[PDB]
């Protein structure tokens, strides 16, 4: 059949009974905010912030919190954070390219010839459409975080829970230490895009659309991947249509329209209307409503740096950045998902990614020797056309200019630290995630002599319309430990250093568990400021504090994924003088892919991370630094 999974438990079985996202006690939030400020501020700064926190907690903040709590109780079908968080991404005027859109790249098919571009674009496309069909059918397994996979991720549990009504099903999972996740974002994976509008963008979905969008050399093509009866088009016919597209010999347009999706959102909002004005609504709707965007690049990957630039931004002509996601396939079969960040917290994307990798490699629709269906693709594939006015041509040119000059400032590089990874660190009773974060703190201290605002995401999807919470890895413990390793490594015994590491790890573990439980401070404080602004009040003084501005100017922005499907991922810095640090702790090695703009130096940062991990692993092995 057309499904890549056959769950006896309906996909959405737990959604009705998910626990509501807790709002922390304001007292806890103020303390936690100050705890994260400790390593960042001097004494005079810290005292000023502490005084503002007192004022806030006993006054305007106390009042905002009472209203936040009342509002939450009026809105028990959702979470306090979900609306405000969408609103922040969608109201942001900056280009989505680099500022927000990340990528994850697939591992190659382990069968060599299945990495042929045509074969792999066909297999990935068919698997993606299979995912869509499995999701619609409720045949996708629910997303569930198990504490004990061996009792709860079993056919025996699945066979019972399916009989418990959705009003009660979460309780069944809970009693087996299993935590179903929110899946309310999953539908936005497909037939979905972000539409630029003045002031605040729009998320658009059209579930009735049955066609794929394909970009090649900046040209736009559409063809059906689902037939009239809702079945997947014969893979051999999909193969024929993609070969057809890959056979097109037209050069890159003089004004490639995809450039516009990289603009400032107010600029693109104006230019889109002009497209509409010039009779392009119908062509736009075909782009907007496509299942997803498949991008066929006509060059192989030179190296990991080239790979990272290609998947993260490319040359501006061959990605439709607004689309829920772009599935990219290069001439050597290298493949990635570049995705639009505003529409979800990316958990949907990873699930999709993992299933699509598995299905495409273990159950490919076609082989490298498959003969494409004898079809007439010129009839089945429409090559889209935009009616471009003088003003639109001027706008595409200015879009290209802005894009090329920004991308020029972006550097990316990576390391593969091979001395050890997850298995060695677990033996030493340390959280692998905490050790990586420590290394980044330590590296930044070595390179810049500073402790700076650091961001790690944690999913809050165990709750109804849960999103993410910020783990703040820069702690008094990482600061002390980095200072010991960097400023005076001869001052401490290995024993002392080891115990310092255990303290970083334990605190990081604590913050991780609290964040997952909604007990960070970042979302709470943000929701309070949103509510103040939404009620038309002046911004409270707490938020005008330079320490607050600084806490939310995330110089070290970090992200990790743990998947057999993922080769690497990447994202640009979130601030001009920041790093974008994509990392993974594998069993025997640790990977880091780091981006920077002109004001930071990623290459040196990577040498420093290398050195820090070398020192860390030395001290854990019993060796002097």
Swiss-Prot record:
It is found in: Mitochondrion inner membrane. Residues 1-147, 178-625 are mitochondrial matrix. Pathway: Lipid metabolism; fatty acid beta-oxidation. One of its GO terms (molecular function) is acyltransferase activity. One of its GO terms (cellular component) is mitochondrion. It is a peripheral membrane protein. The modification N6-acetyllysine is found at residues 208, 274, 479, 513. It is an enzyme of class 2 (transferase). The keyword S-adenosyl-L-methionine does not apply. Residues 148-177 dip into the membrane without crossing it. PROSITE patterns: ACYLTRANSF_C_1 (PS00439), ACYLTRANSF_C_2 (PS00440). The active site is at 341 (proton acceptor). Keywords: Acetylation, Acyltransferase, Fatty acid metabolism, Lipid metabolism, Membrane, Mitochondrion, Mitochondrion inner membrane, Transferase, Transit peptide, Transport. Pfam families: Carn_acyltransf (PF00755). InterPro entries: Carn_acyl_trans, Carn_acyl_trans_N, CAT-like_dom_sf, Cho/carn_acyl_trans, Cho/carn_acyl_trans_2. Belongs to the carnitine/choline acetyltransferase family. This is Carnitine O-palmitoyltransferase 2, mitochondrial. It comes from Rattus norvegicus. The lineage of its organism: Eukaryota, Metazoa, Chordata, Craniata, Vertebrata.
């Amino acid at each position: 059949d057309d499904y890549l999974q056959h769950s006896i438990v309906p996909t959405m079985h737990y959604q009705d009974s998910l626990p509501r996202l807790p709002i922390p006690k304001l007292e806890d939030t103020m303390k936690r905010y100050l705890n994260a400020q400790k390593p960042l501020l001097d004494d005079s700064q810290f005292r000023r912030t502490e005084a503002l926190c007192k004022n806030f907690e006993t006054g305007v903040g106390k009042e905002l919190h009472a209203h936040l709590l009342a509002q939450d109780k009026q809105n028990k079908h959702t979470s306090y954070i979900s609306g405000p968080w969408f609103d922040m991404y969608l109201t942001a005027r900056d280009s989505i390219v680099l500022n927000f859109n990340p990528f994850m790249a697939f591992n190659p098919d382990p069968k060599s010839e299945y990495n042929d571009q045509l074969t792999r674009a066909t297999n990935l496309t068919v698997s993606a459409v299979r995912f869509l069909k499995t999701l619609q059918a409720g045949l996708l397994e629910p997303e569930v975080f198990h504490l004990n996979p061996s009792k709860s991720d079993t056919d025996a549990f699945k066979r019972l829970i399916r009989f418990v009504p959705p009003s009660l099903s979460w309780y069944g999972a809970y009693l087996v230490n299993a935590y179903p996740l929110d899946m309310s974002q999953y539908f936005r994976l497909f037939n979905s895009t972000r539409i630029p509008r003045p002031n605040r963008d729009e998320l658009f979905t059209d579930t009735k659309a049955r066609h794929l969008l394909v970009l090649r050399k900046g040209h736009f093509y559409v063809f059906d991947v689902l037939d009239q009866d809702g079945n997947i088009v014969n893979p051999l016919e999909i193969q024929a249509h993609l070969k057809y597209i890959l056979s097109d010999s037209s050069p890159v347009p003089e004004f490639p329209v995809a450039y516009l999706t990289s603009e400032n959102r107010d600029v693109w909002a104006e230019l889109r209307q002009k497209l509409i004005f010039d009779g392009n609504e119908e062509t736009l709707k075909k782009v907007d409503s496509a299942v997803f965007c498949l991008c066929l690049d006509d060059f192989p990957m030179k190296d990991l740096i080239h790979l990272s630039h290609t998947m993260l931004h490319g040359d501006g002509t061959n990605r439709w950045f607004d689309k829920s996601f772009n599935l990219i396939v290069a001439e050597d079969g290298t493949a990635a998902v570049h995705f639009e960040h505003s529409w979800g917290d990316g958990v949907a994307v990873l699930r999709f990614f993992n299933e699509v990798f598995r299905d495409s490699t273990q159950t490919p629709a076609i082989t490298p020797q498959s003969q494409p269906a004898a079809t007439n693709s010129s009839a089945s594939v429409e090559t889209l056309s935009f009616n471009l006015s003088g003003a639109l041509k001027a706008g595409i040119t200015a879009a290209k200019e802005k894009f090329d000059t920004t991308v020029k400032t972006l550097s990316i590089d990576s390391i593969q630290f091979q001395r050890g990874g997850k298995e060695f660190l677990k033996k030493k009773q340390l959280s692998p995630d905490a050790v990586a974060q420590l290394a980044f703190q330590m590296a930044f201290l070595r390179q810049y002599g500073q402790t700076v605002a650091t961001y790690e995401s944690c999913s809050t999807a165990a709750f109804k319309h849960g999103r993410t919470e910020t783990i703040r890895p820069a702690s008094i413990f990482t600061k002390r430990c980095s200072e010991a390793f960097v400023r005076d490594p001869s001052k401490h015994s290995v024993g002392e250093l080891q115990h310092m590491m255990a303290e970083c790890s334990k605190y990081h573990g604590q913050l991780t568990k609290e964040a997952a439980m909604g007990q960070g401070f970042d979302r709470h404080l943000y929701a309070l400021r949103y509510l103040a602004t939404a009620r038309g009040l002046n911004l409270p003084e707490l938020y005008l504090d330079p320490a607050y501005q600084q806490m939310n100017h995330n110089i070290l922005s970090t992200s990790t994924l743990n998947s057999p499907a993922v080769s690497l991922g990447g994202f640009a810095p979130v601030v001009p003088d920041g790093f974008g640090i994509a990392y993974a702790v594998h069993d025997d090695w640790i990977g880091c892919n780091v981006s920077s703009y002109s004001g930071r130096n990623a290459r040196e940062f990577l040498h420093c991370v290398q050195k820090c991990l070398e020192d860390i692993f030395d001290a854990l092995e019993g060796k002097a630094i």
